[PDB]
């Protein structure tokens, strides 16, 4: 079943947004505020931004056919991070920790 | 007299808020989202929260008697950072660099 | 897309390189289920994947675009993440190798 | 209670004076020596000088009714520096490095 998978994706997303992982999840909770930061190049480099509050909306909206679609957007999020920042920056540190939460639980789907 | 000083303070606040210093000013731009971060003790420890936004509004209402009441609040902000956080934490290092901008320009007061 | 694939082929070369061997070697060849007495590997892991199956496919010009390359690599980390418990060393060794992958994939033009 | 706070402020001042920080505290252990420096204007510009010994001496004499009066002099000290000197000068870097030691430990105070 497809939503049988999708409510397991939805459970992952609860976990990502949950407190336990907030120390490193917080910069993905909402989309990078390129305006407040002075990021004149952000939207030239990230053609398709993506963050967990977008993923939560698309989940509540029911825009997701399969769990591959879910996973595709979450990886997009992390890769935008890895693309925009240097490897030594603190966001990359965080984004890794979170992704490793995601990749693990995602791999335990039936 | 004490309003040519407040004019000078406004020029400071505008430099703090300026995009030049955004790299380390951003965490002070609005309140510290305790609920999102998971900070259940932030309001235990920090009894009088303060952000450059709070400062800007108090200036915009002309609710500052003199330059010292200005400085009280901008220091209260930095203190709260320094109280809530460890010394090794990135915010503190951001808070210090911002304070250095403030403290220097507050010292060139007429 | 071969311009993109030149870049993937470099990432693959980087993964197999000596720099990362510390944590790369459990993914170098197929997991040896005979060896380990893991009678339940192939029950749980339907589509196995190693870096040198990936190299074999790279050399055969099998990859259409970078998605196909990245799919087979992520599949590799995922089998590991699925088969194993989180506390296990390979789960950390895979996570270290993947970060190296995901970063460098993300820089791709 | 006041002499608990002033006990703590006392410990700050002992920390300021300590060997750890002496690389950047040395321009502040004693009064700025206008005479040694050939500075016929230092006292025109800085009406109310201050330094750590003057603070140590007041701490010794119990001239401080509370923690604010402590901090206000320790800040008048860093301010006198930021007011007299250019920002490119070593003293300003020193005053800052030492101030950030002070400001931190001051906020930890109950
Ligand atoms: C910038 C930064 C500094 C830090 F110390 C810790 C984090 C997490 C940081 O990253 C962010 C902090 C806040 C925010 C807000 C709340 C505004 O959306 C976003 C990020 C951030 C998040 N994500 C996912 C990213 O991919 C990139 C982010 N930020 C990039 C960024 O701001 N770079 C600047 C570039 C200019 C330099 O002088 C300083 C660094
Ligand atoms: C946490 C953090 C990491 C980092 F690399 C850079 C900053 C600025 C950080 O601090 C903040 C990031 C975002 C925000 C938002 C946007 C939610 O208002 C606030 C802070 C923050 C800002 N200020 C001024 C503070 O004094 C404290 C702040 N944040 C503290 C904080 O998040 N603590 C937790 C404590 C639990 C730990 O497991 C992880 C850290
Ligand atoms: C078992 C083990 C211990 C260790 F310290 C490091 C690794 C990589 C280990 O795992 C492997 C060791 C060798 C090999 C060889 C080279 C023979 O293909 C493979 C693995 C291995 C690799 N990958 C990618 C995996 O996902 C899982 C692997 N090994 C699973 C494994 O052996 N599990 C057992 C399960 C039974 C338990 O009692 C103890 C752990
Ligand atoms: C001049 C200088 C050079 C240096 F590498 C480091 C310091 C601290 C320097 O400043 C001082 C050196 C000695 C002393 C003594 C110990 C005599 O009180 C004080 C200072 C000094 C300290 N503090 C807190 C100040 O605010 C200012 C100080 N001195 C300013 C000063 O000397 N400026 C002149 C201005 C004229 C210029 O042509 C050359 C430099």
Sign of the Cα pseudo-torsion (B27, A102, C24, C4, in order): negative
> Could you tell me the two tokens for C60?
């055969």
D52 lines ligand 4 (CB under 6 A): no
Among B18, B36, B85, most A C-beta atoms within 10 A, so best to mutate, is B36
Which partners does chain C have (≥3 C-beta pairs < 8 Å)?
A
Give counts: helices (H), strands (E), chain C.
Answer: 7, 0
Q: Residue D109: which of D8, D6, D7, D2 has the closest Cα?
A: D8
Q: Which two tokens stand for residue D10?
A: 């006392």
> Of the bound ligands, which one is closest to the alpha carbon of residue A35?
1
CA of D83 to the centre of ligand 4 (A): 13
Closest chain A residue to B37 measured between Cα atoms? A22
The ligand placed nearest to the CA atom of residue B85 is 2
Residue D59 makes CB contacts below 8 A (sequence gap 6+) with: D6, D9, D10, D13, D70
The single-letter DSSP state of residue B69 is H
CA distance to B104, D84, D88, D89, per residue, from D44 (Å): 19, 10, 22, 20
**All partners of chain A with 3 or more CB pairs under 8 angstroms:** B, C
Q: What angle do CA A42, C11, C68 make, to 5 degrees?
A: 85
CA distance D32 to D78: 12
Residue with CA at minimum distance from ligand 3 atom 25: C80
- Helix boundaries (H) for B1-110: 2-17, 22-25, 34-37, 42-45, 52-60, 67-84, 90-106
Contact A22/B29, CB-based, under 8 Å?
no
Reference D94, options D38, D47, D43, D51; nearest CA is D51
Domains of chain A: total? 1
- Block residue for tokens 């809530």: B84
Q: How many CB atoms lie within 10 A of CB C17?
A: 11
Q: Which residues of B touch D79 (CB under 8 A)?
A: 103, 106-107
Specified resolution (Å): 3.1
Domain residues for the domain of D81 are 1-110
Q: Tell me which of C15, C20, C31, C43 to substitute to probe ligand 3's pocket, judged by most ligand atoms within 8 Å of the beta carbon.
A: C31
Ligand 4 lined by D35 (C-beta under 6 Å)? no
What was the structure determination method?
X-ray
Q: Which residues of D touch B100 (CB under 8 A)?
A: 96, 100
Query: In the structure encoding, which two tokens stand for residue B32, read together?
Result: 């510290």
Long-range contacts of C65-71 (CB under 8 A, 24+ apart): C65/C1, C65/C4, C65/C5, C66/C1, C66/C4, C66/C5, C66/C7, C66/C8, C66/C105, C66/C108, C69/C5, C69/C8, C69/C12, C70/C8, C70/C105
Distance, CA of D5 to CA of A104 (rounded, Å): 50
Q: What distances in angstroms separate CA C23 from CA C55, C73, D19, D98, one per listed residue?
A: 18, 15, 44, 44
Chain C residues whose CB is inside 8 A of the A100 CB are: 95, 98
């Amino acid at each position: 079943k497809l939503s049988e998978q999708l409510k397991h994706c939805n459970g992952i997303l609860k976990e990502l947004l949950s407190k336990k992982h907030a120390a490193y999840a917080w910069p993905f909770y909402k989309p990078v505020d390129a305006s407040a930061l002075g990021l004149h190049d952000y939207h030239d480099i990230i053609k398709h931004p993506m963050d967990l509050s977008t993923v939560k909306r698309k989940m509540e909206n029911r825009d997701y056919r399969d769990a591959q679609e879910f996973a595709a957007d979450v990886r997009l999020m992390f890769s935008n991070c890895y693309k925009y920042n240097p490897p030594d920056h603190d966001v990359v540190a965080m984004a890794r920790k979170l992704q490793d939460v995601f990749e693990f639980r995602y791999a335990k789907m039936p």
